[PDB]
Design a binder for these strands. Structure first.
Lengths: 93, 98, 104, 87, 98, 79, 92, 108
DNA sequence: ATCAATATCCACCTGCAGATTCTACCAAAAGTGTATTTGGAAACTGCTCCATCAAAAGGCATGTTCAGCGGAATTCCGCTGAACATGCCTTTTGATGGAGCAGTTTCCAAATACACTTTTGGTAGAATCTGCAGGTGGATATTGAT
DNA sequence: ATCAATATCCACCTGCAGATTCTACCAAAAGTGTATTTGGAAACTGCTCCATCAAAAGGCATGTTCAGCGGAATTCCGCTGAACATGCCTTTTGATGGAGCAGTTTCCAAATACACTTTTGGTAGAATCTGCAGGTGGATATTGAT
């Protein structure tokens, strides 16, 4: 089985543009984008943690990585969205 | 006889190709170049058709971006005609032979 | 039994991402919050580029987003263009742009 | 065809009209006659370098078939990340 | 009343400075700029002596190379006087403006 | 101003090591602006590594790690 | 605070028995060895993951080297490497 | 006295035990073969010799016996291959190579 | 061709700041000996898709003509940068509190690890659906001669 | 400016292939729930080394003068863009055999996993040496004026 972020890309697509679809070649590019960004971020997290003699990658490493990688406004918003999601996941119980 | 002045059809073409995305190098010929180079590198190799398309996609994106830089180097010289010296200046600065 | 994505209010898979972190060997341990924070960031970013690609399609009178649409959305946005300044979007073409001195 | 023949001089398959079209998308208005051979040379080096790594990734996987991933990984190494072929 | 012609001393300076490796920017002023730029990112910061040194070493190494590419661009346009358009073109092809 | 602390004679000296023979009057300002952008980009990353390690002192390694991320790998101060 | 400094010095004495080295130079060498280590190790990491393998072996180190070093340098690096593993494998 | 070091077995100056330790704690893979740290240490030693050998000559050539940064820069940027390998590296206190574009020389 | 002014080399000298050889306390390594576990090679093989042969036809490459106009070479002339030496400010150099950077001890929240149980994202296989590519006509520019 | 040749714009329009639609099996995930383990935050602290203040040290700002460099204007030519005729080779649609890629069970060499013992590489305070960088002196090459 070959996993893809496709169904998830499609859900979000419908949220921002209810009546728009995507060609498979476009979805393919989108899948590469999600994998690429994932690797860069995890990668940054990985090093960040080593530079600190830390065997664990936490929401905190993921955040500094995002800060190091994304441009101004994108970074501001991503940090916000992630903080927000952690806080909420945290509060389910 | 009607005749467009030199440079008119050239701009027409720029607008034409900048408005599109199809590859500009003939497919089969490009594939043979790939096979020739790969072969004079390691005999008996096979290629997924999509590996050749990925190479053509990247090579054309590479050359187009290079021509832009070249165009800028020519204009820097107050010219509109790109020459080898321009392609070489752009690659030297790009760090491809700097 | 609820998924962690739902628990986090996310559309992206929190379990898949926590799994991918492990198998990718990035650290001895991976905290619980990491995949949650990363799945959100991933989702946030695809929303942004899909918003812009959708508009590009609209502008070119198209309903289905194709590669050129992604390319226009990325190259026309400073941040995204910078985030992908060394990425090549196959079948995306370039932005129309003719230097001044070339005109009549 | 009837067959099995020698690959030779295929760099000339990169025709002058095709190079011209590329310079066009590149926003170039006038092209000196010496550009075509210089361009073939630049393209050949580019290709040799991506194919060399791609094919290296193939050998390491003890395969006979160069995959799109091989090309995709070779491109990443080279700083020319490609989207749309599995990476 | 002796006098060296225009450029004779410049050439002499080129020769001298390409032989040496000492930093060419006065430290104190450099340190002020570093600290000032940093204060915009986090207030009340301290700097290891070596941190400031690594930054200066990196900055001169960077500028000097940028001055090399700038020169090539001026020369490409048949000049010997580097100008801003020359720095602009270089950084632009370096992708620092892309 | 501090950026003005990066003097003409120093910029001229750099240019020299870079092989430049004649320098237009407008280069000096242009250079500072370039130097300024450089430092902001690098320092911003270093300081991010400082805070990450909950410190109030930027370290040579914080700068070296920053430089490496900018594709400006530096030998001589660690790593 | 570990460093390759001593082994760097040993190698120096085999190559230039009567040549010394300043601190700043030793520091530069140290960075050099760490940089190459990281570059080579990293590629070997990718190599294994691409092929869904759990182990980084000499195989991975060699290919990593082929991909990283320039032609002739790579050639010799591959031999030195192969040599050392052999000598090692042939010793009680 | 006896227990022989791995580096000595592989006949190397570089620390095999350490390279091995560094590969593991580096998070590069789940497992690490026995030969990798040997092979890899062999490669680092070789490259280290390659530069020191060249930088040493730069020292000789300058009537100097102690290798300094300048010597290392001169050795690297004068070697096509080493230069390419360190194409995006900056050697502190290395300076540049003496070089003046011809068109800038006095018109003799 | 003839000096006159300077900058550049060079051989020798020497003080000291940074390189070194020594000693010893030692914890983090690294090697070693034993029991346990497991990744991934070998062997069999199902089945995807790569190489290739075939035919037809028209999109496009090739090659020629012709002359517009862009590029380079040459003369010119302001004005802008280089050289300079004039007098002074900031920087560099070296010495002293202190606030953080780490070394250490601790215990708790959080992360394995593991055994089930349950929900899901893939898939290949049927079938219907649907945006748009590409053909068409003709009405609105855009060009270029006059 | 007016006018004729041509290219571009574009809304209208339907067959087709690529996208969206189930019905299905599903073992691979992801979630659920103890039990065991521990990483790293938090508090307390002792020594570095970083920031700051005084002072002796020296490169920069400033104004003048002018030669030479860079852009403007003028000119000539040969090269590269249009336009056109001709025809082959790329593109397309299909089928075919089989080479490899990729799946599955199997099982041993190699690797993790403690535990025990030996040792080496780093830190530290002390003591000593030594490569070489400024510093001198005098010779001589370079540069520029006449």
């Amino acid at each position: 089985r070959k996993e893809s972020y496709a169904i998830y890309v499609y859900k979000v697509l419908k949220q921002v543009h209810p009546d728009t679809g995507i060609s498979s070649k476009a979805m393919s590019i989108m899948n590469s984008f999600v994998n690429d960004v994932f690797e860069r971020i995890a990668g940054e997290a990985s090093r960040l943690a080593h530079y600190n003699k830390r065997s664990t990658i936490t929401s905190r490493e993921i955040q500094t990585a995002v800060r190091l990688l994304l441009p101004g406004e994108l970074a501001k918003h991503a940090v916000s969205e992630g903080t927000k999601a952690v806080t909420k996941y945290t509060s389910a119980k | 006889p009607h005749r467009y002045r030199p440079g008119t059809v050239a701009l027409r073409e720029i607008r034409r190709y900048q408005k599109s995305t199809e590859l500009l190098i003939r497919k089969l010929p490009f594939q043979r170049l790939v096979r020739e180079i790969a072969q004079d590198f390691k005999t008996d190799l096979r290629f997924q058709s999509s590996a050749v398309m990925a190479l053509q996609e990247a090579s054309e994106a590479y050359l187009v971006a290079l021509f832009e830089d070249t165009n800028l180097c020519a204009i820097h010289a107050k010219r509109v005609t790109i020459m080898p010296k321009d392609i070489q200046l752009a690659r030297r600065i790009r760090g491809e032979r700097a | 039994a609820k998924t962690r994505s739902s628990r986090a209010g996310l559309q992206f898979p929190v379990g898949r991402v926590h799994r991918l972190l492990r198998k990718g060997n990035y650290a001895e341990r991976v905290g619980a919050g990491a995949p949650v924070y990363l799945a959100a960031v991933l989702e946030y970013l695809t929303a942004e580029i899909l918003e812009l690609a959708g508009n590009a399609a609209r502008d070119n009178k198209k309903t289905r987003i194709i590669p050129r649409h992604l390319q226009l959305a990325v190259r026309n946005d400073e941040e995204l263009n910078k985030l992908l300044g060394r990425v090549t979007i196959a079948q995306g073409g370039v932005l129309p742009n003719i230097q001044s001195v070339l005109l009549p | 065809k009837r067959h099995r023949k020698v690959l030779r001089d295929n760099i000339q398959g990169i025709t002058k009209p095709a190079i011209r079209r590329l310079a066009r998308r590149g926003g170039v208005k006038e092209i000196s006659g010496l550009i075509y051979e210089e361009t073939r040379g630049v393209l050949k080096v580019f290709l040799e370098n991506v194919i060399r790594d791609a094919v290296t990734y193939t050998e390491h996987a003890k395969r006979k078939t160069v995959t799109a991933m091989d090309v995709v990984y070779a491109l990443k190494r080279q700083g020319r990340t490609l989207y749309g072929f599995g990476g």
